[PDB]
Amino acid sequence: GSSGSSGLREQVKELFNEKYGEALGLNRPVLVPYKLIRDSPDAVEVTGLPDDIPFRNPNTYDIHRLEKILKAREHVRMVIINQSGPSSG
């Protein structure tokens, strides 16, 4: 319930998605199966995120977190714990 232009949200979206891709060893951004990771916390590892900020759907965070995350976009790093992905899609 605010006025302006919700961009960060999307920015963060592509961010987490971007990380996933790189983590998957791909060269393209891929959505993050938070639903899975949720039930399976030993599926993908998420790090680099800002302190005092967990790792969940970017569609909930606040201007701060949204920014913090973005402020740690270069720090944010994903590591495939248990999943393994194919090559050349």
XYZ file of C-alpha atoms in Angstrom:
89
model
C 0.000 0.000 0.000
C 2.565 2.527 -1.169
C 3.145 4.813 -4.130
C 6.166 4.850 -6.409
C 7.619 1.987 -8.415
C 8.374 -1.406 -6.920
C 11.658 -2.207 -8.623
C 13.936 -3.503 -5.893
C 11.535 -6.397 -5.456
C 12.118 -7.518 -9.024
C 15.788 -6.637 -8.735
C 16.125 -8.949 -5.757
C 14.113 -11.561 -7.616
C 16.555 -11.646 -10.508
C 19.332 -11.522 -7.938
C 18.416 -14.700 -6.098
C 17.571 -16.210 -9.463
C 20.902 -15.074 -10.858
C 22.800 -16.652 -7.989
C 20.929 -19.916 -8.416
C 21.921 -20.026 -12.067
C 25.594 -19.514 -11.318
C 25.289 -22.006 -8.486
C 23.691 -24.460 -10.887
C 26.825 -23.921 -12.939
C 24.704 -22.447 -15.707
C 25.114 -19.139 -17.499
C 21.531 -18.022 -17.005
C 19.323 -16.917 -14.103
C 16.980 -19.538 -12.700
C 14.133 -19.147 -10.237
C 14.724 -20.308 -6.684
C 12.562 -23.212 -5.492
C 12.217 -21.664 -2.055
C 9.350 -24.065 -1.474
C 11.780 -26.944 -1.839
C 14.763 -25.341 -0.151
C 12.289 -24.578 2.609
C 11.343 -28.189 3.232
C 14.858 -29.170 2.231
C 17.340 -26.805 3.896
C 20.049 -29.195 2.768
C 19.275 -28.645 -0.895
C 20.890 -25.298 -1.608
C 23.134 -23.113 0.517
C 22.586 -19.370 0.670
C 25.206 -16.976 1.982
C 26.447 -13.420 1.611
C 23.025 -12.104 2.551
C 22.878 -9.108 4.901
C 23.080 -9.609 8.647
C 19.800 -9.776 10.527
C 18.203 -11.013 7.325
C 17.162 -14.588 6.519
C 16.791 -16.152 3.093
C 13.223 -16.276 1.839
C 11.051 -15.097 -1.029
C 11.986 -11.524 -1.965
C 8.273 -10.805 -2.140
C 7.886 -9.952 1.526
C 11.026 -8.159 2.643
C 11.010 -4.449 3.392
C 12.616 -1.453 1.728
C 15.525 -2.007 4.086
C 16.024 -5.727 3.603
C 15.175 -5.326 -0.064
C 17.984 -2.794 -0.213
C 20.292 -4.626 2.162
C 20.047 -7.733 0.014
C 20.712 -5.655 -3.079
C 23.513 -4.024 -1.123
C 24.876 -7.535 -0.748
C 24.075 -8.716 -4.255
C 27.799 -9.036 -4.851
C 28.176 -10.767 -1.506
C 25.196 -13.074 -1.858
C 26.394 -16.500 -2.932
C 24.562 -19.760 -3.515
C 25.991 -23.247 -3.162
C 24.230 -26.385 -4.333
C 24.317 -28.652 -1.305
C 22.287 -31.497 -2.754
C 20.719 -31.164 -6.184
C 23.221 -31.281 -9.023
C 22.174 -29.867 -12.374
C 22.839 -30.873 -15.988
C 24.875 -28.935 -18.521
C 24.091 -27.346 -21.867
C 20.361 -26.785 -21.552
